[PDB]
């Protein structure tokens, strides 16, 4: 199951 | 023994041809188990291995929403990266991300990963400490400063040491028929005349899983590294992999050459010779 933590550069 | 779970993600912009295409796949070891493609008619995370099919609707809904949200943030990121590199809007660019965890036989975290590349080049990587960053250039340093300010690493560490490991443990149990089976290579040597003076000896490994393998030629007990053609390990399409290693052998020297095979499905390394 995936990482659920939105990250933007 | 040891195992890994990894998610791979690629967004490719296509100016004038709509929004960037987003494709993500997940693996346990060398087994593909999920995929998502934004160009599918109805994009959803889809199963690709039998042992994930038992996950219920809430799993597929949640995973699908994660994938859709990552597609969207990648599109914002691709716009950001044009600014960071002072690039025009006219060209296609690539954003890649990989993350996941490696565990030992007892299931504890051995290493975690979370890293990005832009246009095929390393961009920013979470270090092995799961707490600090390696930025490839001054653009990635801008990202690093944002991620330090927002304590992103702490959130990644919590996932990688917690959920990542626990999902992998579940998948290894549900998939114990396959994920916990090594299929050893089927091995043989073939001979391929080139001229009157020399022939190729080709040492084959077929039908093996997982993909990791060592396949070497010796002559009189000396490794022939510089003189061996070693093809990349390649998928057969039935879960298994193939590889070969070849050497050019002067006529009459064949029995001086030995092929050596190491694979975790083998209790002991194999030695093979050409058998006319």
């Amino acid at each position: 199951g995936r990482l659920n933590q939105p990250i933007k550069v | 023994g040891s195992h890994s779970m990894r998610y791979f993600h690629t967004s490719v912009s296509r100016p004038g041809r709509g929004e960037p295409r987003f494709i993500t796949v997940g693996y346990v070891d060398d087994t593909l188990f999920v995929r998502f493609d934004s160009d599918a008619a109805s994009p959803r995370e889809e199963p690709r291995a039998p042992w994930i099919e038992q996950e219920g609707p809430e799993y597929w809904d949640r995973e699908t929403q994660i994938c859709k949200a990552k597609a969207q943030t990648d599109r914002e990121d691709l716009r950001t990266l044009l600014r960071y590199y002072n690039q025009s809007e006219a060209g296609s660019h690539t954003l890649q991300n990989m993350y996941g965890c490696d565990v030992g036989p007892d299931g504890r975290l051995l290493r975690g990963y979370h890293q990005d590349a832009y246009d095929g080049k390393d961009y920013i990587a979470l270090n092995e400490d799961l707490s600090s960053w390696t930025a490839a250039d001054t653009a990635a340093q801008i990202t690093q400063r944002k991620w330090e300010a927002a304590r992103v690493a702490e959130q990644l560490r919590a996932y990688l040491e917690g959920e990542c490991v626990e999902w992998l443990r579940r998948y290894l149990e549900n998939g114990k028929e396959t994920l916990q089976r090594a299929d050893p290579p089927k091995t043989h040597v073939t001979h391929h005349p080139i001229s009157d003076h020399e022939a190729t000896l080709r040492c084959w490994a077929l039908g093996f899983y997982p993909a990791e393998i060592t396949l070497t030629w010796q002559r009189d007990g000396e490794d022939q590294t510089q003189d061996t053609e070693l093809v990349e390990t390649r998928p057969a399409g039935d879960r298994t992999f193939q590889k070969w290693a070849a050497v050019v052998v002067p006529s009459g020297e064949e029995q001086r050459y030995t092929c050596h095979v190491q694979h975790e499905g083998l209790p002991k390394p194999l030695t093979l010779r050409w058998e006319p």
Binding site: - | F8, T10, R35, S92, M98, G120, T190, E232, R234, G237
Partner: protein, 100 residues
């Protein structure tokens, strides 16, 4: 913009036996950027309905794909993989050799 040209291997799933159904694979790897075109050929003509894997990549970020179709090899039929990529000035055709 960096570019990395594809490695190309064309091969069967099982050792070829004339008249026995099998799978013809073309594995393209090590390439960047990801845009690529791959055909499988029978006697120089494109095979229809070839399938392929979803885009993925290696530890060094380079991309890989598998293209594949069912085939039943014979003594005389010739098979090949034809690849186009920005690194190539013309399409590259790699013939299937059952000994590789």
């Amino acid at each position: 913009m960096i570019q990395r040209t594809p490695k190309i291997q064309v091969y069967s799933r099982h050792p070829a036996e004339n008249g026995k159904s099998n799978f013809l694979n073309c594995y393209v790897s090590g390439f960047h950027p990801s845009d690529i075109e791959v055909d499988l050929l029978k006697n120089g003509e494109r095979i229809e309905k070839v399938e392929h894997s979803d885009l993925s990549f290696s530890k060094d970020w380079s991309f890989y794909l598998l293209y594949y179709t069912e085939f039943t090899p014979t003594e005389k039929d010739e098979y090949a993989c034809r690849v186009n990529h920005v690194t190539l000035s013309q399409p590259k055709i790699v013939k299937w050799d059952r000994d590789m």
